[PDB]
Design a protein around this ligand. Structure first.
Ligand SMILES: *[B]([O])([O])[C]([C]C1=[C][C]=[C]C(C([O])=O)=[C]1)[N]C(=O)[C]C1=[C][C]=[C][C]=[C]1
Length: 263
């Protein structure tokens, strides 16, 4: 709704930064509303969903096991590794690393998973293969959150991220069992409470993933809908603000309230 676009512009004014926005119809693929759709923004932690999608496609091909366990060391630990740091001892299975990467944004768990699939170059190839010729992952955690102005490394476009999430989630790409598993992980998101979840009415469904990085970067990707079923895709990225975390979360949650209102 254009009123939502007003809020996106109000946000750009508040944060003193650009805001990329996109609403997608989950069923048809139709674009509902947009803003800075083809500009590049840093994915930050939102790439974790893509990562686990590639991991799931390997599992579907029998090239990987969810039950497979992985061991690592203190040597592998990166800042912000809430679960991983807890099992230095017993290691973790593929499944748990994805859970950890998505529901808690665990940095080390992402790094371990990237290694398993072939690193950033392979992720990029995976994406490019499925029709996304824009989204690129160049670095590992946590340098990928640098967000230096104009750098194309580790970025996406709101338009590209939206359709790719759509394909993962509803395309024939992943098995039914894997798509479901991916949705399940997103739905259990334990760290995005102040963002869109904060504007959701009771009974609605939401499967999401957020990100935060240097230079005021912040963003979220999500599939939501009323009555326990997702029906739309919303992507929101911002970069360049001098605003604090709270103000940044406030603006995003404000865009979501507008989205709901005009549903
Ligand atoms: B990710 O953005 O690449 C990665 C981990 C992270 C940190 C904070 C919030 C989220 C989120 O809300 O989805 C994801 N980013 C970093 O590791 C940067 C960082 C930022 C702030 C605290 C710790 C790390």
């Amino acid at each position: 709704h254009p009123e939502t676009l007003v809020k996106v512009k109000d946000a750009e004014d508040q944060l003193g930064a650009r805001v990329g926005y996109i609403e997608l119809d989950l069923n048809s693929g139709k674009i509902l509303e947009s803003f800075r759709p083809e500009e590049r923004f840093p994915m930050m932690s939102t790439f974790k969903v893509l990562l686990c999608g590639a991991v799931l496609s390997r599992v579907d091909a029998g090239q990987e096991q969810l039950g497979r366990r992985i061991h690592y060391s203190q040597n592998d630990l990166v800042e912000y590794s809430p679960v991983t740091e807890k099992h230095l001892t017993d290691g973790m299975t593929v499944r748990e690393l994805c859970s950890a990467a998505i529901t808690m944004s665990d940095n080390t768990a992402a790094n371990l998973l990237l290694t398993t699939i072939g690193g950033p170059k392979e992720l990029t190839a995976f994406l490019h293969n499925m029709g996304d010729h824009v989204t690129r992952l160049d670095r590992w955690e946590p340098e990928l959150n640098e967000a230096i102005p104009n750098d194309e490394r580790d970025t996406t476009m709101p338009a590209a991220m939206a359709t790719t999430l759509r394909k993962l989630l509803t395309g024939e790409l992943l098995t039914l069992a894997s798509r479901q598993q991916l949705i399940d992980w997103m739905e259990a998101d334990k760290v995005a409470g102040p963002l869109l979840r904060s504007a959701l009415p009771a009974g609605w469904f939401i499967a999401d993933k957020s990100g935060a990085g240097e230079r005021g970067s912040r963003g979220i990707i999500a599939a939501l809908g009323p009555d326990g079923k997702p029906s739309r895709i919303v992507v929101i990225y911002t970069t360049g603000s001098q605003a604090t975390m709270d103000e940044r979360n406030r603006q995003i949650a404000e865009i979501g309230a507008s989205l709901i209102k005009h549903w």
